[PDB]
Design a protein around this ligand. Structure first.
Ligand SMILES: N#Cc1ccc(CNCc2ccc(F)cc2)cc1
Length: 284
């Protein structure tokens, strides 16, 4: 029985390598990675790969791996797929730990914008979880942490992390990670998957996919939001993406809203993530 080597970048930046049968469905690999991570609350997570166009794609666990990666390498990343709106409701601390690792990368990458003070507060909880209580012996007036906290590090940010870290004496790792998540979950771009698009007039917008629905970002002035329960049907056709909205009270007709995506693959990608979010957060 012929087996393919898989490589998976884990959220701590390490590599997990395993072999699966070449006709294996995505679930086979995902189960091996989750067992490696001692992760039981698996439903929030998934594997991504990079396509022939270098776009991030979710590996569909119900479909053959080979039919997805096609001509590319069996190289994947382990990621959060569904960001829980209330991380305190997760059963296990280790689930919150992996969600923290994802969010740290969302911040450093700049996908999750964050004020100076929130960058410092999140960094201070991470340090507290991983190193424990503040130690002046580890940090002089000129201290720079090995921890990546932000898309652009400054000395002022390092100092503020230390100042807040001093205030967390006696905090345990699960406690610190829960505080991290209580702050992170409030950020306006928390768990938002952003997609470049044009409206039915050709104006550049962003479509954001998240627990609370589909967000349209026209710019700092005018942001529309469609809660998932208001959405009856998501479709795509060529480069176009459409949402069918429930009729409003006393309105005779449903309303269909149309967007232009970069190409057909990008319309299909957006359709699939919206459908998956709609289903997940309907049931969660
Ligand atoms: N410079 C340099 C340099 C960078 C990376 C590596 C090893 N990368 C392994 C790896 C590949 C694909 C994958 F998905 C997971 C892990 C070695 C040297």
């Amino acid at each position: 029985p012929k087996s393919m080597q898989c490589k998976v970048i884990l959220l701590d930046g390490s590599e997990y390598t395993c072999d699966v049968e070449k006709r294996s469905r995505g679930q086979v690999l995902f189960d091996k990675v989750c067992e490696h991570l001692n992760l039981l609350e698996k439903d929030y997570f998934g594997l991504t790969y990079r396509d022939a166009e270098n776009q991030k794609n979710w590996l569909d666990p119900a479909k053959e791996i080979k039919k997805q990666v096609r001509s590319g390498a069996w190289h994947f990343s382990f990621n959060v797929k569904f960001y829980p709106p209330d991380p305190a409701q997760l059963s296990e601390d280790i689930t919150r730990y992996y969600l923290c690792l994802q969010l740290r990368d969302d911040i450093v990458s700049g996908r999750l914008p964050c004020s100076f003070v929130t960058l410092a507060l999140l960094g201070s909880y991470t340090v507290q979880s991983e190193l424990g209580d503040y130690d002046p012996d580890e940090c002089g007036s000129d201290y720079i942490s090995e921890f990546r906290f932000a898309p652009n590090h400054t000395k002022e940010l390092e100092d503020k992390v230390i100042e807040l870290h001093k205030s967390h004496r006696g905090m345990t790792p699960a406690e610190a990670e829960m505080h991290f998540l209580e702050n992170a979950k409030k950020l306006s771009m928390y768990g938002v998957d952003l997609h470049h698009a044009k409206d039915s007039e050709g104006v550049e917008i962003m479509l954001g996919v998240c627990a609370s629905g589909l967000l349209i970002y026209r710019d700092r002035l005018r942001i529309n939001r469609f809660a998932w329960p208001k959405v009856l049907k998501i479709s795509y056709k060529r480069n176009n993406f459409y949402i069918k909205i429930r009729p409003g009270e006393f309105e005779q007709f449903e309303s269909t809203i149309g967007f232009k995506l970069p190409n057909h693959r990008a319309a299909k990608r957006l359709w699939k993530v919206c459908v998956e979010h709609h289903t997940f957060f309907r049931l969660l």
